Design a protein around this ligand. Structure first.
Ligand code: HEM
Ligand code: HEM
Ligand SMILES: Cc1cc(N)nc(C[C@H]2CNC[C@@H]2NCCNCCc2cccc(F)c2)c1
Ligand SMILES: Cc1cc(N)nc(C[C@H]2CNC[C@@H]2NCCNCCc2cccc(F)c2)c1
Ligand SMILES: C[C@H](O)[C@H](O)[C@H]1CNc2nc(N)[nH]c(=O)c2N1
Ligand SMILES: C[C@H](O)[C@H](O)[C@H]1CNc2nc(N)[nH]c(=O)c2N1
Ligand SMILES: [Zn+2]
Lengths: 407, 411
């Protein structure tokens, strides 16, 4: 019942009771751990709604009060009548903040209660979505002083009338397959880029081409829109020591905005809910730039540094990795665009876990995702035992719309 | 039930069937994952089926399943169990069992090597002095003047749990740690408690930063005894940097032979509570963990100072910069002295090949991602991008409580 987690660096031991309130399954069993797998009716809706309202009314200290019972009866009647229901504004904002709070893969959760929620449930068309999204982008960017936000479009109905952002993030760079056989720009987005071209997008065919938005309103075919360039804040990447660094032609965008996930609140499904915060440096400098299947710039950089690339044992890849990540952080800071380094972000996450353990009785955390992709054991989270479990409200993955959509 | 694992960098998909054989439990449930938790007297009743599963595996491995020799062995073991409450492994079975325990060790990135393990049978050992002799021979053999060879020495199995053989050291070779009255630690802070026990047992501590600990050995449930490994048997490597001439003046060295001595080897239900085993190092074990953990030698600051790094803000990545330099130094120093070491790129690349081989030939490879991924430069190694399945197979190595916690002192 009561589970203990220990930090092996500090000997601090926390007791987890919050896991007892988990409903969804992990992928694991008593016989197998799937911890490193990336992807492991009227009757159905009422217990889900009730579970959500009970936690809501408990959060505002009105559990078992009249307003609580009343809301439950009101929902019960709407469910029996329409087969669904509508969240109050207060419940939508609570549900969204809590889905972030419950995101076990997110190191940035110390910030969870400072999320600006934009209710776009009154949206009906792709142009309307474009508008809400531009508004989200400008608000969140805030001239480089980034603020966390989520925009929430209408909830799923019959499943043939879904709102979807087809982009994986609101702002991402194009990827093109080449006559050479290699890839110009971002290889992660080769397929999406093709679809955009297939939809009529005139591709500049460069290394850092901001992708158009491809927006699906109410089950209809999606539509292309160019985000106003002045709304897309970008950072040229230079190094505080190396004068040649700027010549690599590197830049990245300031706003990380996940747009392909599904927000589940009290059994209601929000299939278009783009949300955004600000970057941890390693997401760009380690993953975006140095993954072999991404920009893969390690060879180039270590070349310019005149390193010994003969043997893996000179740690040429590791040396270059560090300089690149220094550059990313230096650039964003120099341009006054919010960014956090992995030391600061992980330190804050430990403080957050501590807060959550004493205030809420736990914090679901996925160690495989929380520990940064460089310098793991020099960050405090490496030495932190974590319990992973699934609480609702939540953000979930969903299939890429092009495998689902019927044209 | 077939389970797929994908490499997200290469798109290679593998199918696991081996996990079906798994009997033991993980710590996880359908509702909770304990994948990052460090630690999530047997009767005839339970012993014969444990013996049977094991001998079934063994006789299948040698292509003699269902043979007369297979059947006669099961009968002989069954008879030995009913008569004596336990049984003795043949030498061939002990070798197979020890190799399999390593093969099954889900936290071990070095398992490509599993079939080359030198097994030393020390089941005729009776005293601590006998243990010390077996251990010196293991160290000399394994060390091989820098050309390290993997080995394990297996002392007599548990009987009633009151006559246990134990190596009280966590590793055969490790440096003393000394807590000072001002609250600082001299040497390795990981070994302060064990160092105290040694001193109480009568060890005269030289009180330096890298004193090789004496062996503390327990035979047949008796009180443990102290022994100094001959220094000529302990290969050490002074750490220097190929470019930074001041690195040598930090005064760092490490030993060449990593030899775990506190785990329990389980084979066919028998428990070998003293089974020291050794391989060779992956650099990050020394360079990242032993040197740079805050709770270990903690040299990041001092190295960063000597490199004149900007230490005013974490975002200068001064810790990351120093970290890489230290690890370059460890590898350089070992290679220059012709002492076997593997870097984390090569070891992880080799592990992916091993794992793919295992899936093809064995139907699976249990692996603990949390442990397999190196403690620096995670995602620039191919294991970061490899989905893994963790489950428990026997024969196995298991943790056991530190013996000072459980031992009954005779006096
Ligand atoms: C405010 C600053 C934030 C930081 C520094 C941050 C950081 C991160 C990082 C490093 C990851 C791991 C992703 C990866 O490495 O590929 C992550 C994942 C995630 N984040 Fe946060 N995040 C922030 C804000 C947010 C917000 C505002 C939300 C939603 C309201 C959110 C929800 C999530 C979710 C659902 C995941 C898991 C996504 C997946 O499984 O791919 N984050 N975040
Ligand atoms: C041949 C060279 C070897 C290499 C490079 C190697 C490497 C490693 C590494 C890096 C770890 C992770 C532990 C840590 O970082 O704290 C590990 C763990 C482990 N290794 Fe290997 N190893 C080797 C040989 C062996 C041998 C010979 C055995 C037994 C016969 C073995 C059994 C284990 C076990 C049981 C663990 C888990 C330790 C624990 O859970 O505390 N290894 N090894
Ligand atoms: C809101 C926010 C802020 C910050 N700083 N950071 C984030 C994480 C996103 C940005 N950087 C990557 C990550 N979002 C990508 C989510 N999945 C990609 C990996 C993947 C591929 C295939 C199948 C899978 F199941 C998963 C979100
Ligand atoms: C045989 C061999 C070769 C190599 N290269 N490497 C190894 C792993 C050991 C050496 N370097 C670290 C590791 N063994 C260190 C201690 N292991 C137990 C971890 C632990 C600590 C506290 C509580 C727990 F539950 C568990 C073995
Ligand atoms: C196979 C493995 O689960 C996969 O590579 C994971 C590992 N940890 C990760 N951690 C983060 N933060 N982001 C990722 O994309 C991944 N990828
Ligand atoms: C809390 C966490 O499980 C613990 O720090 C683990 C993480 N991964 C590890 N991986 C290895 N190889 N060795 C370790 O000691 C650890 N420590
Ligand atoms: Zn698990």
């Amino acid at each position: 019942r009561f589970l203990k987690v220990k930090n092996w660096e500090t000997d601090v031991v926390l007791t987890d009771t919050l896991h007892l309130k988990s409903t969804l399954e992990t992928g694991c069993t008593e016989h197998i751990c799937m911890g490193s797998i990336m992807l492991p009716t009227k009757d159905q809706l009422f217990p889900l709604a009730k579970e959500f309202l009970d936690q809501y009314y408990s959060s505002i200290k009105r559990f078992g009060s009249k307003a609580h019972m009343d809301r439950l009866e009101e929902v019960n009647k709407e469910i029996e009548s329409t087969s669904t229901y509508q969240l109050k504004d207060t419940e939508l904002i609570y549900g969204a903040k809590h889905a972030w709070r419950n995101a076990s893969r997110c190191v940035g959760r110390i910030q969870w209660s400072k999320l600006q929620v934009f209710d776009a449930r009154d949206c009906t068309t792709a142009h309307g979505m474009f508008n809400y999204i531009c508004n989200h982008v400008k608000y969140a960017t805030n001239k480089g002083n980034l603020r966390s936000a989520i925009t929430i479009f209408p909830q799923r109905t019959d499943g043939k009338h879904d709102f979807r952002v087809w982009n994986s993030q609101l702002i991402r760079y194009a990827g093109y397959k080449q006559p050479d056989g290699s890839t110009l720009g971002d290889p992660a987005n080769v397929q999406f880029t093709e679809i955009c071209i297939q939809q009529g997008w005139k591709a500049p065919r460069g290394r850092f081409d901001v992708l158009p938005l491809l927006l699906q309103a109410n089950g209809n075919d999606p539509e292309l829109f160019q985000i106003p360039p002045e709304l897309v804040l970008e950072v040229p990447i230079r190094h505080p020591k190396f004068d040649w660094f700027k010549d690599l032609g590197l830049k990245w965008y300031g706003l990380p905005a996940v747009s392909n996930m599904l927000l589940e609140i009290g059994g209601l499904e929000f299939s278009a809910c783009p949300f955004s915060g600000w970057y941890m440096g390693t997401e760009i400098g380690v993953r975006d730039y140095c993954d072999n299947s991404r920009y893969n710039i390690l060879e180039e950089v270590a070349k310019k540094m005149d390193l010994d690339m003969r043997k893996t044992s000179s740690l040429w890849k590791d040396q270059a990795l560090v300089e690149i990540n220094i550059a990313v952080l230096y650039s964003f800071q120099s341009d006054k665009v919010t960014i956090v380094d992995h030391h600061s972000a992980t330190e804050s996450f430990i403080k957050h876990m501590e807060n959550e353990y004493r205030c809420r009785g736990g914090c679901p955390a996925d160690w495989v995702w929380i520990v940064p992709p460089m310098s793991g054991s020099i960050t405090p989270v490496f030495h932190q035992e974590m319990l992973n479990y699934r609480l609702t409200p939540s953000f979930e993955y969903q299939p890429d719309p092009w495998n689902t959509h019927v044209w």
